[PDB]
Design a protein around this ligand. Structure first.
Ligand code: K2G
Length: 166
């Protein structure tokens, strides 16, 4: 049962114009089996457009490649991002957590997606009561990208709504 191809793709921006299908593949094959690897080029001049994409055999291989950033490919630090579901942000909205969810509930769950920098449990401006939603800020966008493509998030027994924030 193969994961959907879209979830196995990495868009690589910031390429050296000298990077080729072959040199992009040789680099990113260090972190998994590549079923596809393409440098985008102008149709007339064949000059690189400065970006391309690689497709791994599994999502765990995508994770391995992202965890090995920064990637210097043919002498240039490139910018890998998971394919769109790009709104590149480090913060999520977490809704549906009700009044009994605390900081440690959110931390213990979300810390396995990435390094957390801020947890903000929202409270009512007048009463101080919890409003039932929170924001979590990570040190990097790939955490958010992994989070929002999941169908489900269960935190503190609550089925939560999670979206990219701002
Ligand atoms: C009131 C709820 C719907 C809300 N407030 C703020 C944000 Cl930033 C989001 C979101 N989906 O990102 N959702």
């Amino acid at each position: 049962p193969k994961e959907p191809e879209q979830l196995r793709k990495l868009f690589i921006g910031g390429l050296s114009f000298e990077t080729t299908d072959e040199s992009l593949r040789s680099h990113f094959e260090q972190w998994g089996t590549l079923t596809d690897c393409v440098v985008m080029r102008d149709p007339n001049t064949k000059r690189s457009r400065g970006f391309g994409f690689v497709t791994y055999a599994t999502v765990e291989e995508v994770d391995a490649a992202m965890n090995a950033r920064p990637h210097k490919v043919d002498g240039r630090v490139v910018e890998p991002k998971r394919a769109v579901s790009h709104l590149t942000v480090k913060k999520i909205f977490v809704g549906g957590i009700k009044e009994d969810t605390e900081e440690h509930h959110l931390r213990d769950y979300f810390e396995q997606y990435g390094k957390i920098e801020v947890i903000e449990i929202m409270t009512d401006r007048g009463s101080g009561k919890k409003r039932g939603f929170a924001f979590v800020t990570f040190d990097d966008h790939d955490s958010v990208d992994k989070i929002v493509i999941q169908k489900y998030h269960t935190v503190n027994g609550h089925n939560c709504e999670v979206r990219k924030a701002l």
